Structure 1
Amino acid sequence: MVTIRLARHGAKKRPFYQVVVADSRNARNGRFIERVGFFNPIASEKEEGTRLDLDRIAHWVGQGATISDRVAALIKEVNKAA
């Protein structure tokens, strides 16, 4: 089914995750439909390490796409910052 999930595109030992919309049978870093942001766990101070287009995310959820556990965590952290 269609899902919303991370995609490991970083260097070794220094990850960086593109949060994308993908059919769940595809590979992780492979084919996707729409890139709706990113997350950096090694994000320094004075930079964004989380950016999510929540209107598109709510658009795909209105289409019935599922959300990963980490993406739903990052939506929580945005809805706690805001």
Structure 2
Amino acid sequence: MVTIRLARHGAKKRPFYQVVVADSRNARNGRFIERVGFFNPIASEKEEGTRLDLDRIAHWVGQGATISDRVAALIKEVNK
């Protein structure tokens, strides 16, 4: 299915996430349809350390796309 998921980046110990719309078929790190922003689990001292287009998420929900629990916690991390 087409799903909204966290793509794994940042390499070792301090991971960094790119929030993408992708198909769950085959390859884990396969091709990705669209990016909607970035998420940092680590303190960055900036009030835009994490960035999301919540209206573009609502547009991809408007395509019937699946949501992942880690991205629901990211929508909570921008305080909805």
TM-score of the aligned structures, taking structure 2 as reference length? 0.84
Q: Partners of 2:28 and 2:41 in 1: how far apart?
A: 18
Q: 1:28 to 1:52 in 2, by over 3 A?
A: farther
**Would you tell me which structure has more strand in proportion to its own residues?**
2
SS of equivalent residue, structure 2 residue 32? coil
C-alpha separation in 2, matches of 1:16 and 1:48: 14
Alignment gaps of 5+ in structure 2: none
Measured in 1, the distance between the counterparts of 2:61 and 2:26 equals: 19
Q: Secondary structure at the match of 2:43?
A: coil
Choose between structure 1 and 2: higher helix proportion: 1
Give the CA deviation at 1:47: 5.0
Aligned length in residues: 80
**1:78 to 1:47, Cα distance in 2 relative to 1, 3 A:** closer
Deviations 1:30-71 (A, max 9, x none): 310000011111132235332111121111101100111011
Conservation of the 8 A alpha-carbon contact between 1:41 and 1:49: no
Q: Name the CA shift for 1:28/1:47 in 2 (closer, same or farther; >3 Å).
A: farther
Aligned-residue RMSD, C-alpha? 1.7
CA contact (8 A) 1:7 1:28 kept: no
Structure-2 separation of matches of 1:50 and 1:71: 12
What stretches of structure 1 of length at least 5 have no aligned partner? none
With the length of structure 1 as denominator, give the TM-score of the two structures.
0.82
Q: Which residue of 2 aligns with 1:26?
A: 26
